[PDB]
Amino acid sequence: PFFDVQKKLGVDLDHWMTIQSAEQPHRIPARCHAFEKEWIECAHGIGSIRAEKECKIEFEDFRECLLRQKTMKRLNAIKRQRDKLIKEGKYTPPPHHSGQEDLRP
Amino acid sequence: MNPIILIIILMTVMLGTIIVMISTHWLLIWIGFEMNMLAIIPIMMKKHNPRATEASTKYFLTQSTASMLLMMAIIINLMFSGQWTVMKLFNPMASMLMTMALAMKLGMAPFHFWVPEVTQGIPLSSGLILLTWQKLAPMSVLYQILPSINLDLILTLSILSITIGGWGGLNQTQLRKIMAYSSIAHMGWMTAVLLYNPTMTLLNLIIYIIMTSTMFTLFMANSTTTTLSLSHTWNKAPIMTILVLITLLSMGGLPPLSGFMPKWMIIQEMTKNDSIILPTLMAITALLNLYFYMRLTYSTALTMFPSTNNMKMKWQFPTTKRMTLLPTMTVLSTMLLPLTPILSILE
Amino acid sequence: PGIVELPSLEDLKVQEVKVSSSVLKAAAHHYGAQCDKPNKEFMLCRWEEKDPRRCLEEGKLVNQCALEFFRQIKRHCAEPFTEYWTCIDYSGLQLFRRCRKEQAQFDKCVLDKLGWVRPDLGELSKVTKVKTDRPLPENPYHSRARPEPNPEVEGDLKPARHGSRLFFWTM
Amino acid sequence: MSLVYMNIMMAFTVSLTGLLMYRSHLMSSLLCLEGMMLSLFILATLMILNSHFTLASMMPIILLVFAACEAALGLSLLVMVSNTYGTDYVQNLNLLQC
Amino acid sequence: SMMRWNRERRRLQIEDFEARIALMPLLQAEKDRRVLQMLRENLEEEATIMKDVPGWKVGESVFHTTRWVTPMMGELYGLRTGEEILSSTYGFIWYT
Amino acid sequence: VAAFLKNVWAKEPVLVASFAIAGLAVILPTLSPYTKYSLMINRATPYNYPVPLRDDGNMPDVPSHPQDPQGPSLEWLKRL
Amino acid sequence: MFMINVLTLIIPILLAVAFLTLVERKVLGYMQFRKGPNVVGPYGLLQPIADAIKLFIKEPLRPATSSISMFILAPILALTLALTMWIPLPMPYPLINMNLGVLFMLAMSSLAVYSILWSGWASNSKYALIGALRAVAQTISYEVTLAIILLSVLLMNGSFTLSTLIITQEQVWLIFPAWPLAMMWFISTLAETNRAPFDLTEGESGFNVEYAAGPFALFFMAEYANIIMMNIFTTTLFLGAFHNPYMPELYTINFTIKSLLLSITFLWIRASYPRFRYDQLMHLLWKNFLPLTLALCMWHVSLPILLSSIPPQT
Amino acid sequence: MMTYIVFILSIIFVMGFVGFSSKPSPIYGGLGLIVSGGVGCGIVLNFGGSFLGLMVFLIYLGGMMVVFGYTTAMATENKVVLGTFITGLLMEFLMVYYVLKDKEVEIVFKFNGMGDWVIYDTGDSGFFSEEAMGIAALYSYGTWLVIVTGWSLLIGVVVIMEITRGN
Numbered sequence A: 001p002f003f004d005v006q007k008k009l010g011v012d013l014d015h016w017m018t019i020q021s022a023e024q025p026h027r028i029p030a031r032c033h034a035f036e037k038e039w040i041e042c043a044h045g046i047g048s049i050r051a052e053k054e055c056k057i058e059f060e061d062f063r064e065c066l067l068r069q070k071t072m073k074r075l076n077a078i079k080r081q082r083d084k085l086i087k088e089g090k091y092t093p094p095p096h097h098s099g100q101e102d103l104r105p
Numbered sequence B: 001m002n003p004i005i006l007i008i009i010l011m012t013v014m015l016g017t018i019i020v021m022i023s024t025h026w027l028l029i030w031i032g033f034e035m036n037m038l039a040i041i042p043i044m045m046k047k048h049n050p051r052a053t054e055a056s057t058k059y060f061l062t063q064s065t066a067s068m069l070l071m072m073a074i075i076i077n078l079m080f081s082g083q084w085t086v087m088k089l090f091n092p093m094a095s096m097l098m099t100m101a102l103a104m105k106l107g108m109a110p111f112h113f114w115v116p117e118v119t120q121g122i123p124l125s126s127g128l129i130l131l132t133w134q135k136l137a138p139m140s141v142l143y144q145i146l147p148s149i150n151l152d153l154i155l156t157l158s159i160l161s162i163t164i165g166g167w168g169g170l171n172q173t174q175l176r177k178i179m180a181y182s183s184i185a186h187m188g189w190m191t192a193v194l195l196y197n198p199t200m201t202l203l204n205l206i207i208y209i210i211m212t213s214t215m216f217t218l219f220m221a222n223s224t225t226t227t228l229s230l231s232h233t234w235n236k237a238p239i240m241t242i243l244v245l246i247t248l249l250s251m252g253g254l255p256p257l258s259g260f261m262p263k264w265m266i267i268q269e270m271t272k273n274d275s276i277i278l279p280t281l282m283a284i285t286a287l288l289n290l291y292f293y294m295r296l297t298y299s300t301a302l303t304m305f306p307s308t309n310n311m312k313m314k315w316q317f318p319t320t321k322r323m324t325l326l327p328t329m330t331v332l333s334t335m336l337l338p339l340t341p342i343l344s345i346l347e
Numbered sequence C: 001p002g003i004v005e006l007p008s009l010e011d012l013k014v015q016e017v018k019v020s021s022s023v024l025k026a027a028a029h030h031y032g033a034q035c036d037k038p039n040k041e042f043m044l045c046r047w048e049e050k051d052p053r054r055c056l057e058e059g060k061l062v063n064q065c066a067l068e069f070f071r072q073i074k075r076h077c078a079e080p081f082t083e084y085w086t087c088i089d090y091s092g093l094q095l096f097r098r099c100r101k102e103q104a105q106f107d108k109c110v111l112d113k114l115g116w117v118r119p120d121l122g123e124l125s126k127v128t129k130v131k132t133d134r135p136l137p138e139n140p141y142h143s144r145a146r147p148e149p150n151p152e153v154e155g156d157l158k159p160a161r162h163g164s165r166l167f168f169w170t171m
Numbered sequence D: 001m002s003l004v005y006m007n008i009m010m011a012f013t014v015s016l017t018g019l020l021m022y023r024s025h026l027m028s029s030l031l032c033l034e035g036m037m038l039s040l041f042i043l044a045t046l047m048i049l050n051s052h053f054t055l056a057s058m059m060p061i062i063l064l065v066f067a068a069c070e071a072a073l074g075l076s077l078l079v080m081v082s083n084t085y086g087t088d089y090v091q092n093l094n095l096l097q098c
Numbered sequence E: 001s002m003m004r005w006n007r008e009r010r011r012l013q014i015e016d017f018e019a020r021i022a023l024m025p026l027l028q029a030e031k032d033r034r035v036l037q038m039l040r041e042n043l044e045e046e047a048t049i050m051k052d053v054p055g056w057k058v059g060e061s062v063f064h065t066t067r068w069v070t071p072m073m074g075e076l077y078g079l080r081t082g083e084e085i086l087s088s089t090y091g092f093i094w095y096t
Numbered sequence F: 001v002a003a004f005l006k007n008v009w010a011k012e013p014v015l016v017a018s019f020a021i022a023g024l025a026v027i028l029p030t031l032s033p034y035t036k037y038s039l040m041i042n043r044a045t046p047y048n049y050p051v052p053l054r055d056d057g058n059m060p061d062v063p064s065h066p067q068d069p070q071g072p073s074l075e076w077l078k079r080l
Numbered sequence G: 001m002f003m004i005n006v007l008t009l010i011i012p013i014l015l016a017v018a019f020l021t022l023v024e025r026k027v028l029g030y031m032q033f034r035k036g037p038n039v040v041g042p043y044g045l046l047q048p049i050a051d052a053i054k055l056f057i058k059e060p061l062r063p064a065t066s067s068i069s070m071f072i073l074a075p076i077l078a079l080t081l082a083l084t085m086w087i088p089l090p091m092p093y094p095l096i097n098m099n100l101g102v103l104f105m106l107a108m109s110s111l112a113v114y115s116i117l118w119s120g121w122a123s124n125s126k127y128a129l130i131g132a133l134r135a136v137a138q139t140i141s142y143e144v145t146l147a148i149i150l151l152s153v154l155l156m157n158g159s160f161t162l163s164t165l166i167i168t169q170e171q172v173w174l175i176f177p178a179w180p181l182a183m184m185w186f187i188s189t190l191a192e193t194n195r196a197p198f199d200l201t202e203g204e205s206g207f208n209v210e211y212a213a214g215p216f217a218l219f220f221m222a223e224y225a226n227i228i229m230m231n232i233f234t235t236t237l238f239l240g241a242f243h244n245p246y247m248p249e250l251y252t253i254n255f256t257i258k259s260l261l262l263s264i265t266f267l268w269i270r271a272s273y274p275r276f277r278y279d280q281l282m283h284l285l286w287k288n289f290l291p292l293t294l295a296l297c298m299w300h301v302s303l304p305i306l307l308s309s310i311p312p313q314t
Numbered sequence H: 001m002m003t004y005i006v007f008i009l010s011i012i013f014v015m016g017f018v019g020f021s022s023k024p025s026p027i028y029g030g031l032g033l034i035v036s037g038g039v040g041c042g043i044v045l046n047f048g049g050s051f052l053g054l055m056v057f058l059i060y061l062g063g064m065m066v067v068f069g070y071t072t073a074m075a076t077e078n079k080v081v082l083g084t085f086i087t088g089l090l091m092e093f094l095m096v097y098y099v100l101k102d103k104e105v106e107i108v109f110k111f112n113g114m115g116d117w118v119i120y121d122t123g124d125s126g127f128f129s130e131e132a133m134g135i136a137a138l139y140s141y142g143t144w145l146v147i148v149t150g151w152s153l154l155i156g157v158v159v160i161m162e163i164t165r166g167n
């Protein structure tokens, strides 16, 4: 049972720490505020059964914001091909990726 | 124990169960279980003897391990979902860990190995609290996460609980251990129908709480903790043997009693979902607990016993023990089957 | 998915405000006073577009108006400003409160030679309104179509047809 | 995912297997339980700090406080066992087998 | 005395925060050009590195949305030296 | 009411000072006139950026510049 | 360059602890109508040197220990914690300028009871273990009022920053709005360092009677490395000096003089009273300091709100 | 080598748990859990959770493990231990060799083998620690949480005084 006392009495006991998209102190956004907002606004009211199949793309974007598995996989691929071309000698790093250019601002 | 402090501690047990029932945030679920455990530990140590200290230590270790597994499940849910709603889980690993942790809090097999011991070490009123009130909160969490519960895990735990609760109580002469293996078997019966129809899970929970409350209240009214002291009841109060008769017949599932009501409905909700073999062997195992109930009332409740001379002193005194709700609970634990469609109020 | 579009390196070249943080902090009140409009057009475009690629040119206007803010200091009041940001620059926390007489010399020379009034306590934290010509973003999150909600309940509530219909219970 | 999370979970499972099947001092079981709590604190802290989810920063303190209160409760049970047998050997806790 | 001096200190804190607020648009503009600079440089170096790999789309977004995503730390400082990496990832934490 | 109070002030003056300071700390913010200004200063402290509004055409109470006379002011704080 | 700063922190700590023994013996001498050391150095100035050399060439026990490893780890932890307490102390600038230096010092001083506990473990004498348990319960008792008094004062500071506490007291000493906190704080720091009237390691045999002259000189000096620190911490906390940022040595001379007078106040307290019975200082903490400290913590919670004097966060 | 420092601490953290879950004694079990709390606290401090790191030092190590060592002193006056220790150490170092030779591993979940410096954020938070203001939110947004925690601690005091009495 979920006796929803908080909605029946109209009190906010623990809805505030529940999601990252809620009102934070000093309006601090979470890192995946936009993704979680998009997925929550997709899955709202349609039930969990329709949400698991009709909001898959928002949930994959949000889970990949959280864990960054695809981004780290792409960085692994680029850094590994770069290490292979450094070991073979077919590539050289530029002066702005070796630390010789005295950064912009 | 000071009665004011006893009231405060029982209200804290109730408050922890209420916090698990009403809260939307997983941390408050964990807090409610922590509050419930921390508050129930003195209820078990009410009489201050080494068996209660052993029972409370074993209960503490099992519920603490379960609470740590629950928090690890919540934390993996936070990894893979970035949020905290008490709803379905977003990882099968969190699903498995939370199902395991709630199975440890209920006392389901293979984590059943504390329920016959702890119930033996604590008094009858605290064993009543353990076997009735402490089932409400994890069944609420299982009620809310059932879109994520793995079916094979919950059915493995359920039928393992039913077999171990069946074949564990055949050997038992202690009444508290009979109630504890009955607890394990009934939690298997509640959790096997959970993913099919959770209203029948709630029906089994309420009928179980009524019958268990009836049995522990009769045990407190007669001050009997063993089979043989239960046999000495007819020469003191003959109606109490009749009531433990009809209530133990109801807990095994005889028709036309009310404890036949849930499990029949459970079979009725498992053949709709085209499961035939599973409720069949499930009720085959329930026939074994009904069968040792029928030995434990045929051989040792009906046919009248050798008594002791000091019992003829106890004829001159009536029961001044507060048998709170005992006739109501005895009527409800036996004569409720003609009102079987009352279950819709639990939908 | 798709290719993320990035502007070229020529689209990012602007003359930088190459001064230190104590230099920026020394002139910050007169900067917020005099460089109000392009800074607020930029921060309005920046909170509305939610995308820095759509906020380059307004940002260039910021870097256009900041430099003209400092040139107008350098043509007129270079020495009291230098004496002021040096004293700001000594402090490890960069206290305004340790530097009030140099602030007074800089504010005096700025009000005399440029007519600028320093903002008071509570002015630069105001929510102001910005009149731009750029349109309002109709979908700043690039959100797709939301799923249609489930059908709500309608119709008057009738009794159950012959009760519970549970095996033989006629009610 | 993150690689430090694997080490924190492996620490949790090490202390979980240390709790479960040893049959030793009771204090060693409480130490394994509080190692489980320590790894939960570290893991909750790294997740909440990683996601910049500000309102859950008070969550691990809660995870500390309750569980440390829990730890206090466990020690008192141990002390009652330490007032009964003279040791905290958990094989003295076998009265309730029969 | 602590009443008068803490009221004075709150006024001084508001003055410091308003100096921060007045500087924030210039810092925001420089930060935007900073991150787009680093992403464009990483894009060109990816285009000159990731040609041997078949089936590779240079600058391919891992997100199904087309919304601007704030660049991760390893996205910006992923192809630079370990000194700048260590500075940008633990400088404030390790600062004194 | 003064016999028990003098008795506890002669026997337990530590606890009398404790309960008196605790009672003052409880009841005195409900009687102080400066408790409003604590709230007012803690909301006047700009931790975030004052994000500007798009001028729709009709917002007279919103200024167009920080030095404009409309908007919230802090003269109550500069005077006190 | 930073290593030179670390060494000019920690080597003068050990020298100041060495000459604190001379100051203790001299000031206790003249208060007891006699002299302290004046033979070994001119005016006794070579007495700590001769004493440290004498201890370092005595034979150690190396007894039958329950743990050899914790017998080694107790002086190492004692000296390491006694030296790391000084690193956020702003005088006027700290070695490590951290945002949470107050909470850092509170946590590291809470870690100091393991030296007492492991020194009671390492001796096989069960009575030394009893005295160690009494010392640990004393120290963890007074850490409670340290934490709550320190919290009540930092409600007037605005942050956990130790260098902000100089800015806090630019007009008035913080002993004027918080002298009951200051006097309970001072007696509680006196009870932290096992210092008379709260010492229970000379009479009814302490926890460190197993140690003889190899580790003992280290333990002792780590113990006095806490004492000066606590007084310096009290000097930062209630007697904040004038800081001119263009002449920092004005602050350094001012806080140095105040910290010397406060350490001499420790010496002048221990030469003036008998000791507590053990349950009498437990009565002092749990029944006299703790209700007042809770009451004044309520007062310093509600007081900046009711005076509109909430301090700045930064 | 300095870029992986969090990772390096995490390895010690795992080692520290195998240091005490082997359980030679509650004495050395406590010592291993204190060293483990220190290194996991270093993990927490290296992500910017300075207040939560000082809560590990003040409350876990300085508050609670003191009470564990105290009770170990007062109440509690090989082959299995060393074998379980070296078994867990061999398991962990083979995991380190796998994840450093592969930069990808799967035991239960899929785990990257690069350092976790990549997964951070590139922004600033102004004049506050976000973690500090989130813990400050316990008194403004966390009312029900404060109520249930204070009631649990009051009940905890009452419960300890009940079961330690023995009457």
Ligand SMILES: CCCCCCCCCCCCCCCCCC(=O)OC[C@H](COP(=O)([O-])OC[C@H](O)COP(=O)([O-])OC[C@H](COC(=O)CCCCCCCCCCCCCCCCC)OC(=O)CCCCCCCCCCCCCCCCC)OC(=O)CCCCCCCCCCCCCCCCC
Pocket (backbone or CB within 6 Å): B256, B337, B338, B339, C168, C169, C170, C171
């Ligand atoms: C203008 C406004 C005012 C107008 C006023 C007009 C009325 C004035 C008179 C006022 C009194 C009215 C009485 C109630 C209405 C009539 C009830 C009735 O006859 O139901 C027929 C009902 C079905 O017959 P029907 O032809 O379909 O319906 C005819 C009517 O239209 C019946 O209506 P229906 O078609 O709507 O039936 C609905 C449905 C019809 O039922 C069904 O659809 C099937 C489901 C029935 C339940 C099956 C459960 C089987 C497993 C459990 C067995 C338990 C052990 C057996 C009993 C052992 C002792 C307790 O009922 C149920 O499902 C509810 C459960 C059955 C309750 C029956 C009433 C009991 C009241 C007295 C209790 C005393 C014990 C009675 C027997 C208890 C066992 C039932 O008969 C049975 O189920 C067999 C049991 C006997 C009926 C009870 C007779 C009541 C009076 C008994 C007096 C003698 C007492 C002796 C001492 C105590 C016993 C030791």
Ligand SMILES: CCCCCCCCCCCCCCCCCC(=O)OC[C@H](COP(=O)([O-])OCC[N+](C)(C)C)OC(=O)CCCCCCCCCCCCCCCCC
Pocket (backbone or CB within 6 Å): F011, F012, F013, F014, F017, F020, F021, G180, G182, G183, G184, G186, G187, G197, G234, G238, G269, G273, G284, G288, G289, G292
């Ligand atoms: C930091 C700079 C230095 C600080 C000052 C310290 C330097 C001087 C030190 C002198 C030597 C001390 C050696 C150790 C002594 C330990 C024993 C001792 O003193 O025990 C403490 C004693 C303990 O009591 P006791 O031991 O004397 O008595 C026995 C206890 N009873 C009575 C219960 C049986 O007193 C205290 O606890 C007082 C602590 C400080 C109280 C502060 C009160 C504030 C006043 C508020 C207002 C009150 C007026 C009424 C309300 C008004 C409302 C507007």
Ligand SMILES: CCCCCCCCCCCCCCCCCC(=O)OC[C@H](COP(=O)(O)OCCN)OC(=O)CCCCCCCCCCCCCCCCC
Pocket (backbone or CB within 6 Å): A001, B010, B125, B126, B128, B129, B132, B133, B136, B205, B206, B209, B210, B213, B217, B220, B322, B323, B324, B325, B329
């Ligand atoms: C969807 C779920 C939502 C929630 C639904 C509601 C769930 C209800 C669960 C009920 C659990 C009750 C547990 C026991 C009562 C709690 C307090 C208690 O223990 O009272 C017993 C009390 C102890 O007194 P003491 O002095 O310690 O006794 C020792 C003997 N000298 O006194 C005695 O020992 C006196 C002896 C008689 C006691 C009988 C108590 C019966 C209580 C159960 C009533 C039936 C259940 C309620 C109805 C069904 C609800 C599902």
Ligand SMILES: CCCCCCCCCCCCCCCCCC(=O)OC[C@H](COP(=O)(O)OCCN)OC(=O)CCCCCCCCCCCCCCCCC
Pocket (backbone or CB within 6 Å): F008, F012, F015, F016, F017, F018, F019, F020, F022, F023, F026, G291, G292, G294, G295
């Ligand atoms: C409402 C305000 C806020 C209240 C909550 C906050 C309180 C802050 C302080 C916390 C104190 C915690 C511990 C308090 C325990 C109180 C009970 C007590 O101590 O009773 C026992 C005592 C007799 O002492 P004994 O038992 O012998 O102990 C050994 C010492 N001889 O008997 C006594 O000492 C008698 C104690 C009762 C009389 C005290 C009266 C003080 C009046 C001061 C002025 C009015 C203050 C306003 C509030 C009313 C307070 C009653």
Ligand SMILES: CCCCCCCCCCCCCCCCCC(=O)OC[C@H](COP(=O)(O)OCCN)OC(=O)CCCCCCCCCCCCCCCCC
Pocket (backbone or CB within 6 Å): E092, E093, E094, E095, E096, G073, G076, G077, G080, G081, G084, G097, G098, G099, G100, G101, G104, H034, H035, H037, H038, H039, H041, H042, H043, H045, H046, H050, H053, H054
């Ligand atoms: C038996 C074993 C051996 C026993 C003897 C030796 C150990 C005991 C004595 C040493 C104790 C070490 C304590 C180290 C951590 C202390 C807490 C801390 O670092 O706080 C300071 C600070 C927080 O302030 P903040 O200003 O926010 O940080 C800068 C951000 N602008 O944070 C910072 O400045 C962060 C700086 C980077 C992270 C620092 C991590 C330090 C290393 C981890 C702990 C190592 C010790 C492990 C053992 C502890 C004791 C068991």
Ligand SMILES: C=C(C)[C@H]1Cc2c(ccc3c2O[C@@H]2COc4cc(OC)c(OC)cc4[C@@H]2C3=O)O1
Pocket (backbone or CB within 6 Å): G017, G018, G019, G021, G048, G049, G051, G052, G055, G216, G217, G220, G221
């Ligand atoms: C750290 C250095 C340089 C040396 C000097 C020194 C030690 C070690 C221990 C001690 C010490 O100096 C003094 C010596 O004399 C007394 C006499 C005392 O009482 C007569 C007394 O009471 C607490 C304490 C003491 C100090 C004490 O223990 O190493």
Ligand SMILES: C=C(C)[C@H]1Cc2c(ccc3c2O[C@H]2COc4cc(OC)c(OC)cc4[C@@H]2C3=O)O1
Pocket (backbone or CB within 6 Å): B291, B294, B295, B298
């Ligand atoms: C000892 C226990 C647990 C049970 C088993 C048992 C009894 C009491 C009585 C009897 C009994 O065994 C049964 C066996 O088979 C039938 C079958 C019957 O009908 C199918 C039938 O009808 C009355 C009667 C009987 C026996 C009978 O009298 O208590």
